[PDB]
Amino acid sequence: LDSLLGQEKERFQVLPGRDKMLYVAAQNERDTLWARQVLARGDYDKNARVINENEENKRISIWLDTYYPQLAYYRIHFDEPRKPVFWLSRQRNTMSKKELEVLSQKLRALMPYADSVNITLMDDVTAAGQAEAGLKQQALPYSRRNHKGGVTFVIQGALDDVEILRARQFVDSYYRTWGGRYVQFAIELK
Amino acid sequence: AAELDSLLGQEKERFQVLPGRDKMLYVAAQNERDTLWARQVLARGDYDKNARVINENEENKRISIWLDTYYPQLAYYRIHFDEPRKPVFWLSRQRNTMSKKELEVLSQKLRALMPYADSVNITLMDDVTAAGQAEAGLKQQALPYSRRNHKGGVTFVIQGALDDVEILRARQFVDSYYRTWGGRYVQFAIELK
Amino acid sequence: AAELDSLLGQEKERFQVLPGRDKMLYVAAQNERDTLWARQVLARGDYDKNARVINENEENKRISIWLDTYYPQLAYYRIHFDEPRKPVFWLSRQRNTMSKKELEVLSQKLRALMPYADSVNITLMDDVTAAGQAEAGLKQQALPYSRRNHKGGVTFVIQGALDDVEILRARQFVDSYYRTWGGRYVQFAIELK
Amino acid sequence: HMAAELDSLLGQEKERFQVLPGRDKMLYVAAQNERDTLWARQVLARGDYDKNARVINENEENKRISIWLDTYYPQLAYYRIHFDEPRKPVFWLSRQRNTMSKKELEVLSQKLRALMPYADSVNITLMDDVTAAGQAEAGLKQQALPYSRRNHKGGVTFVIQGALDDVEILRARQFVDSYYRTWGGRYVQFAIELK
Amino acid sequence: HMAAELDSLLGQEKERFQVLPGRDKMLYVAAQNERDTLWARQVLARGDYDKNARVINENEENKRISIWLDTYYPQLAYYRIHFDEPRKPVFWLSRQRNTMSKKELEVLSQKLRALMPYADSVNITLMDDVTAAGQAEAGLKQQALPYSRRNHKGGVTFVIQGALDDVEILRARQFVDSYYRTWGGRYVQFAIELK
Amino acid sequence: LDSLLGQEKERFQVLPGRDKMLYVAAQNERDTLWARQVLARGDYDKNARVINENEENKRISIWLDTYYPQLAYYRIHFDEPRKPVFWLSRQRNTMSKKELEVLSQKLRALMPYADSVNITLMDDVTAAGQAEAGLKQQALPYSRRNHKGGVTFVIQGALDDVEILRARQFVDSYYRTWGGRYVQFAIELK
Amino acid sequence: AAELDSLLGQEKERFQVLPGRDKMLYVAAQNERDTLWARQVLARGDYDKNARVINENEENKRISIWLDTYYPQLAYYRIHFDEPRKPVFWLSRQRNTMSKKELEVLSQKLRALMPYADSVNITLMDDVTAAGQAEAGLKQQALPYSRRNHKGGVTFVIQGALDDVEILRARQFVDSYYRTWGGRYVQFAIELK
Amino acid sequence: AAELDSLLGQEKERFQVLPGRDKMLYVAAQNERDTLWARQVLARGDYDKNARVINENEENKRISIWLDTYYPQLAYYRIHFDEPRKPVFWLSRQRNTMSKKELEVLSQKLRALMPYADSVNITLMDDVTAAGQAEAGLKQQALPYSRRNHKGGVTFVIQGALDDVEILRARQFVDSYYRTWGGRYVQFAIELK
Structure with missing residues (x-):
């Protein structure tokens, strides 16, 4: 690699x-x-x-908001823009290997530069786990809060400038990969 | 009136x-x-x-340290000093485990802890009132939020695209709420978009 | 005098x-x-x-909301509470579509909505005075500008390059203006160079 | 063969x-x-x-030619000159507001060629005011900013509305520099609304 | 009996x-x-x-009278008008640069009285340019700011030097507003040196 | 009181x-x-x-810098400006109850509005002690560093905006009373 | 060369x-x-x-945690990872208490701690060189200072009226010094005037 | 070309x-x-x-210091190290009080002071060009100003009200200027309104 x-x-x-x-x-x-x-x-x-990746994700979402308002997913990655990679939630995925290639196709229609649109089922616990791990790597204390459609990581503690900054960069790092559709982050107010 | x-x-x-x-x-x-x-x-x-x-802030720190040691389980909120010679102490009703009698002892221990106090009133406050008033205060302030109940208490996650002038207001309300209630049961956090 | x-x-x-x-x-x-x-x-x-x-601002908001439902087509500015028992309601002469009859009726619902108000005094204000006052205050403070009419009202695009103070004094003036007139007619904007 | x-x-x-x-x-x-x-x-x-x-640089040359046009063409409806090829500056004039004639426009071309010692020539291209305003809107949307359009005398204004996040503001600032580099400020303006 | x-x-x-x-x-x-x-x-x-x-307010009235003097007295060496008593504005003219005569100066007084409907009268007092510059220096010292004086055409400049702390800057800002309220900016100027 | x-x-x-x-x-x-x-x-x-108190202290210092370059002192307080109060270091005070009223007098000469200039010997350990106590009241961690002509309190820890602010106000509070002639404060750089 | x-x-x-x-x-x-x-x-x-x-910063944290437990007394500075597969570890000479033999064990324990390292070099650095270079770097940078020796190590109190642009420079040098030396022996503080 | x-x-x-x-x-x-x-x-x-x-700036400082002692009356601008083996030293024609003889001698001491320098090339610069260049660059950037001569040289008081950018571009230009000429002759200041 x-x-x-x-x-x-x-x-x-x-x-x-x-x-x-x-x-x-x-x-x-x-x-x-x-x-x-x-x-x-x-x-x-x-x-x-x-x-760019950010604008296309927004566009696609808009479409999904209408024809798949139910869908449980994370983000689309365009490292290879001729094959975008769509991350879906495995544990909340409710579709037959039929319907998924129907989804794939419809996204293909939205993206004329896409040859094929790859679907990839991701693990709900992997999403959330990696948030937690990252929080430790970047040395920010936190508390986890399960809820209806996701998980919140309320970053806690006293927080310096720098300590505010590092957390902001990491949250963007995580969002770049996962979106804020399952996990959202938040700073606590003391 | x-x-x-x-x-x-x-x-x-x-x-x-x-x-x-x-x-x-x-x-x-x-x-x-x-x-x-x-x-x-x-x-x-x-x-x-x-x-x-x-002053109220410093004394609440001090009472808290003490309580960490002598009542490490207490579910409580804050002591007010509007009448510094009769501090009023707010405990949770719902989560209070003491008897009528155990509480006057408390009152007294605190009395001793505060050499300037004449008495130390104790008022069981309503956990529901506490979160109610957080919620009503957010609405009062047109600051959208999402309520997350947890083990300790309640976190109101403040949400939405956040203006500069609307950040400062949020901070200001949150301070207001803490002055009265403390931070031990209800918490405010701002969501990162 | x-x-x-x-x-x-x-x-x-x-x-x-x-x-x-x-x-x-x-x-x-x-x-x-x-x-x-x-x-x-x-x-x-x-x-x-x-x-x-x-407070004046909060009540103005709350009342805006109610008017949003039961009078959605109403052309007004703001409500002045210098005397809260007799809050003055500034309506537009020029866009008024209502009999002396219909007025007082509004006056009375508004009265309901404000239990502290003994009576709500409606007052017909001049669209020309509204705009003319922005025009004047802008010169008093010495801020170059250009007028742009619309559906709704007027947008005063504040022009010219701008100090940290030319910006500030401008932010102030406008606050003073909105205090008096609301922002439903005259709008203010800073031009980008 | 483009691409x-x-x-x-x-x-x-x-x-x-x-x-x-x-x-x-x-x-x-x-x-x-x-x-x-x-x-x-x-x-x-x-x-x-x-x-x-x-x-x-293109910014400085746009100011010098503008001073010049102030005196010799003080009613010209134009946009900006582009220097992607400094040897062949391109100058965007409005079609719908151009009062000049074919040969008149080749005069202009010559005087600018003269005013720019280093140019082989000076391309004039007429541009569609609707395109100018159209591009303002589309990019305003692509940038996810709510706005109100205002027509007026010397063109169009776009009042940028919404409560505006800190990062949303910088986003608007950036896009508007971008718009200005291409189309200049003489026709389309942008303002941030005060709430 | 003062005190x-x-x-x-x-x-x-x-x-x-x-x-x-x-x-x-x-x-x-x-x-x-x-x-x-x-x-x-x-x-x-x-x-x-x-x-x-x-x-x-004194700031606005100083601007309106200044616009007026621009037209009717465009070579007058003056400082500012004071409104501690709005019924009796006092106007500081320079002694050393005053070209007018006793009666001429009572004309001025009358025209300003006329221009200020609310005044009973308008006191003219001649002031010593040396005092003006003297007060700039003394207060610059009282404020513990290092500086270099620069004479020129329309008076004197005080270039404020030193590496300047954040709090030292605000200190200079404040004192200069203060100096300006009294003496105006038409004679003495202040600048912060760039290092 | x-x-x-x-x-x-x-x-x-x-x-x-x-x-x-x-x-x-x-x-x-x-x-x-x-x-x-x-x-x-x-x-x-x-x-x-x-x-004002601040300007007069500066002025007096300037004089002292010349005629009493040796003097060990803190600050002058002008709560009652007809009787300024001069705080001197007891433990480093090296003058006879004679010379002190010579000092007093000379300061009187500098201050035409002073009727008398009061001298008051202060305790070197009281100065420093109260710095320490204040640091605890305002909940800032610190380490003390003795040196040649004084003591430094290097305020330590991670430090928020607020936590920077409170320390700044307290340091001015302490300086208003004691000057920075015995005790100086400093923030540590992490 | x-x-x-x-x-x-x-x-x-x-x-x-x-x-x-x-x-x-x-x-x-x-x-x-x-x-x-x-x-x-x-x-x-x-x-x-x-x-x-x-990366170097994270690994130094991790090695530090470990050392807090297994070598809680060690007087040391920082590990450099210029060659990540041969980390170099800097200990104090003057304050080193180990034998030639005890140190290779260390080297090995660390080797084990770093599954990617081929070896783990150990270099006894000179305490004097360490403070020397702090001092020389401050002079290099025209940033006046006062040196206060203490029990842990040395604190250089940065002094003088402090410019904005001269604050940022000081911070930048101090970062440079820490990258190489760490913060365990020499400390920088800025004096409050 | x-x-x-x-x-x-x-x-x-x-x-x-x-x-x-x-x-x-x-x-x-x-x-x-x-x-x-x-x-x-x-x-x-x-x-x-x-x-x-x-680096150019540090060396300029160090060399200024030495010149402060052994040539305290010397009128110069700055030293350019685009080619460090042959660093060019800009002296003032108009305030030069030295024979071809005395030059080269300076050239040689400066050579000592810079072990990396093979030779130090003195070059006589025009006080009028010095000033004239500030004058021009100030117009290029479009910054209103006024000239004030002194003992020493010229102070260019930058005038007019000033955006956050009018301030910035001005701070930049001036940096560019000082890079080239030092600040021993031409001075720059921002006027306060």
């Missing part, structure tokens, strides 16, 4: 999709904006679009 | 100076800053050896 | 306790700080079941 | 600075932003080039 | 606001600062006095 | 002094400035001066 | 992936942010059960 | 290790961040006895 980690990204990736549009895949808000600026300076906007 | 006007008035003297069973003088300041000022005064007129300055 | 001399030099009372037509006591505070502190006092002494705290 | 075009436009192999010779026997070094500009300006100072070399 | 004078000048029994009638059949309410002004302005609005009453 | 504490101050005090000048005694920087502004609007500056 | 160029170079790969005696993979990130990124990667490609991410 | 093309597109080396005439190695860093990190590296590997880190 030396490879995978020292693996070197191309900053933008231009991906013709099934609708004749070229998609340009960016890695963060800043690059999105910039590329989105190039497209307008060159009259490409009728022919290309800029995408 | 006339009582209200009294409770609610610019009448009270600034500081209030209590004689103590321990032959020390207690001066009751109303807040941190006033306390610091009193402390300064004593130091200048050399009373620091005969008089002591107190 | 002297009429004014007093109005300005008045020593408004910090809290005013007012029995209402629903038997409850109503304590009227000048701002959110006093509201919290009062709301505190009522908690400590078991008034909470008997009395309530009110 | 290979996109590819080269998003290329990062493009040289930081670019030295261009001008008809005025001065050398123009095109920097890409304020920091680089200040860097090159510093390099020139130290090695005594300040007299025969000059640094330019 | 009893000092005593009454430092008195805190003085009424917050002051209503004064003007020759223009408007009423001027003199507030003492921006906040009070905004308060009274709010009280007037609510009780419909906006048409016959107006709020004034 | 109910009196003494609910005792109500006059904001400014006008005190004719032995040099024919009127001194106006203010309680803080802000009031100083304002009164110092009144004096200039009324041409009193040739006849009055504004004073 | 050629060695310098190596130490000092943009050569090194980003992460470095070590096989461990415990049949887990160790990835060595160089800083917090890189660590967080690695952690993210593993989570996505599901290696979180077979590979672990490490 | 091409001369420039390169100068600008150069890939300056991050650290340059340079043996000196005193046998020590000198590592030359571009800025304070790299200096710290390097200074770190030298600590870890026992170079500290052999090598040193230098």
